[PDB]
């Protein structure tokens, strides 16, 4: 007679049924999955089938109204750690799964929860009324675990591994409010979810592992622990990612950006190399040719060097041109080392070596102003320091290096240079908008400045930051594979990031933007004491990502 | 009996099954394809479905490296002439097919071939390794024909003619290189492919002859 305070790893507890669990469902499922041949990996005494293994944990507080959604999960073999490994050698799967819930409360609390299975074809989100489905009610004072089973309600005969199809969804909601009769600061409890395959889960058709690999099915391995710790760079400045920058207003980034369709709207490959263009007018203001600023420009839509697009040459920064003249260093400009070369043979001009500032302008021989849309604009170079002589050749070419630094007037630092007001964008790209409490984020990096090249992180003169939209391994991996059959429009792919003290969640949309649920805060996330990164899977987009650092 | 050097039109030869011909596949294929109505053109005495008829031919050279594909077909009613004639007057099909191979070589050559059936979801491309699938190896000195059966493995109940969906693929490639010990000018042989419908093949919906479809006709006309 064991007590209920100790639970065994094979123990389901109380089995809570629902009207969707029927015998004819199981018989039809087995008899129609039989077209894939005999079932595989169905030995009932194996250790990977008999035990429950960890899936998730969530929080239930007293401020949650009835009908609030606390936890959702889509039907997949990626919810178990061992059926995700075994799916690399098979081409189909069919069957159900069991989910075990443990509520960590006491006998003094009040309140109840509700769980139901949602058939495919129904949108999951706020306004989904769970209590008018066939449901099970679970008390907050329960000591033994409660397990319900999600069956396979599908319109196919089996699920192909790349393209499963329509699946059911398990949703847990709030029946009645949580009550603490004492009242005070202690108002929250925690529930843990675990998973185990059911008795009719199987695979069917064996295949070579050197077929469609694990990097073409789900983008779970695109974001790992060393990517955000010490290996990955950003897609704008090619610098070490140190933090996360919330943007509560919104932004749109076009160049060197990839969606979940294997497509780009920009004009750059996913690599950092030289910027080369020819056939552009070069000039210099004034008459004296010693210590004279150098000017160069060319129109947009003419650079025939890229197989991708001809808006700008490969590697051009997507920043609007800040206008300047005279002996004044501009504020927050993309500057980089380079020189102007001779278009007839390729011989560079040796005396015209300086740091040139790049951007997008509207009138280059006339008055100078920044511009954002690429239609009717042009690409403009102008050196920030004094250079010797100037070539007035009409087809003259420009050669700049890959990486750049910030142009600052003084030795002190400023805010993140790439603010969302001035980002040059091709017309036709979508923007990133806040969805509820979730707001778009960028990836911060320590980038040197032209007023103090010795300055690093933690310096006494301030730290200079430059931001990008995606990490570089992510956009490299997004241009090699296709993930159309991994995320519906209106969903996020969620990763859990743990720290030494707290943990937070980030999500990736179909458009290729990253999100975090922080509201209207503008504080940088430190991202120094990060420990582990774990994938979670598809979740509804109108659900708050958990953000607590403590 | 015939002494191996002459073959009848209804004679398959040896039978080679890899791993995908099962009883539950046929039982699930017959029972589920009844959503289209009663089956049509199902009579196991007719001349069009008891004999093997000509489909294709291909050549095997000495200079063919191992792993190079010599013959590939998707699962379709276009692989037999009489089912291709009958498919213009039906709008749905299900079932499998048989492929007979006759190697026109001599007993002095060397070399092997390999055949496999690929599941529907796998992309047929450069990174496909067919020797890490369940396969069967055929010698170049074989005298009798060898028959390989491809079954119908599908996620849908039947195959519409304008939209079949996902189908398996039969791939035949080089196992080991062709060797002629005398050398010289003779450096290639020929293999002939015949076809015959399987016992569980059927059509369903009668439709109109030369009806238009949502897919596209072959670019031969």
């Amino acid at each position: 007679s064991v007590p209920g305070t100790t639970t065994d790893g094979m123990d389901p507890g109380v089995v809570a049924t629902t009207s969707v669990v029927t015998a004819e469902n199981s018989s039809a499922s087995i008899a129609t999955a039989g077209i894939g041949g005999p079932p595989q990996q169905v030995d009932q005494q194996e250790t990977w089938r008999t035990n429950f293994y960890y899936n998730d944990v969530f929080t239930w507080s007293v401020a949650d109204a009835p009908g609030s959604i606390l936890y959702t999960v889509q039907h997949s073999p990626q919810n178990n750690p061992f059926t995700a490994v075994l799916s690399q050698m098979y081409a189909g799967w069919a069957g159900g799964m069991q989910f075990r819930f443990i509520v960590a409360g006491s006998g003094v609390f009040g309140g109840r929860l509700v769980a139901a299975v949602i058939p495919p074809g129904i949108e999951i989100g706020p306004g989904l009324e769970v209590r008018q489905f066939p449901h099970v009610v679970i008390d907050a004072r329960s000591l033994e675990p409660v397990t319900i089973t999600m069956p396979d309600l599908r319109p196919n005969m089996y699920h192909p591994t790349g393209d499963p199809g329509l699946v059911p969804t398990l949703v847990l909601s709030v029946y009645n409010n949580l009550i603490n009769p004492f009242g005070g600061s202690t108002s929250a409890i925690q529930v843990t979810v675990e998973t185990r395959p059911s008795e009719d889960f199987e695979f069917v058709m064996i295949r070579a592992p050197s077929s469609k690999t694990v990097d073409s099915i789900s983008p779970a391995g695109l974001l790992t622990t060393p990517v955000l710790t010490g290996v990955g760079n950003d897609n704008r400045w090619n610098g070490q990612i140190v933090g996360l920058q919330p943007v509560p207003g919104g932004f749109s980034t076009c160049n060197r950006h990839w969606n979940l369709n294997g497509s780009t709207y920009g004009w750059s490959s996913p690599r950092f190399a030289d910027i080369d263009h020819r056939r552009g007018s070069a000039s210099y203001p004034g008459n004296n040719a010693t210590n004279v600023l150098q000017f160069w420009y060319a129109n947009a839509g003419s650079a025939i060097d890229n197989p991708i697009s001809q808006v700008a040459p490969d590697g051009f920064p997507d920043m609007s041109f800040v206008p300047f003249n005279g002996p004044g260093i501009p504020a927050a400009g993309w500057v980089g080392f380079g020189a102007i070369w001779n278009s007839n043979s390729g011989a560079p001009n040796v005396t015209t070596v300086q740091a040139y500032e790049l951007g997008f302008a509207t009138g280059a021989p006339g008055n100078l102003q920044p511009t954002t849309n690429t239609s009717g604009s042009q690409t403009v170079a102008k050196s920030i320091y004094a250079v010797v002589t100037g070539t007035a050749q009409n087809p003259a070419g420009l050669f700049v290096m890959a990486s750049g630094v910030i142009s600052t007037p003084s030795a002190n630092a400023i805010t993140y240079t790439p603010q969302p007001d001035r980002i040059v964008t091709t017309p036709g790209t979508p923007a990133a908008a806040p969805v509820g409490k979730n707001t778009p984020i960028m990836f911060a990096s320590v980038v040197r400045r032209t007023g103090d090249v010795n300055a690093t992180a933690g310096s006494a003169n301030g730290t200079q930051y430059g931001t990008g939209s995606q990490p570089l391994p992510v956009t490299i991996g997004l241009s090699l594979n296709n993930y159309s059959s991994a995320l519906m429009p209106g969903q996020f792919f969620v990763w859990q990031l743990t720290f030494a003290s707290g943990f937070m969640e980030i999500g990736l949309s179909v458009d290729g933007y990253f999100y975090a649920g922080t509201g209207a805060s503008t504080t940088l996330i430190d991202l120094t004491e990060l420990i582990d990164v774990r994938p979670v899977g598809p979740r509804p987009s109108k659900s708050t990502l958990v953000f607590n650092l403590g | 009996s015939v002494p191996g050097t002459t073959t009848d039109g209804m004679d398959p030869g040896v039978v080679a099954t890899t791993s995908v011909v099962t009883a539950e596949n046929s039982s699930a294929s017959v029972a589920t394809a009844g959503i289209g109505g009663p089956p049509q053109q199902v009579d196991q005495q007719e001349t069009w479905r008891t004999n093997f008829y000509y489909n294709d031919v291909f050549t095997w050279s000495v200079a063919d490296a191992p792993g190079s594909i010599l013959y590939t077909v998707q699962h379709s009613p276009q692989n037999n002439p009489f089912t291709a004639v009958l498919s213009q007057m039906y709008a749905g099909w299900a079932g499998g097919m048989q492929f007979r191979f006759i190697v026109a070589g001599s007993g002095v050559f060397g070399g092997r071939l390999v055949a496999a059936v690929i599941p529907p979801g796998i992309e047929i491309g450069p990174g496909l390794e067919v020797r890490q699938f369940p396969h069967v190896v055929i010698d170049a000195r074989s005298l009798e024909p060898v028959t390989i059966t491809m079954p119908d493995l599908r996620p849908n109940m039947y195959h519409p003619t304008g939209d079949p969906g996902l189908v398996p693929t039969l791939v035949l490639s080089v196992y080991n290189n062709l060797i002629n010990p005398f050398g010289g000018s003779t450096s290639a042989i020929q293999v002939t492919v015949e076809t015959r419908p399987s016992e569980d093949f059927e059509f369903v919906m009668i439709r109109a002859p030369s009806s238009k479809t949502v897919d596209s006709i072959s670019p031969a006309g």
């Binding site: 018989s27 039809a28 087995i30 008899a31 129609t32 039989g34 | 039982s27 029972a31």
Partner: peptide
Amino acid sequence: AAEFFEGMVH
């Protein structure tokens, strides 16, 4: 599995 084919036969 047997009940499915049994019902369709019956």
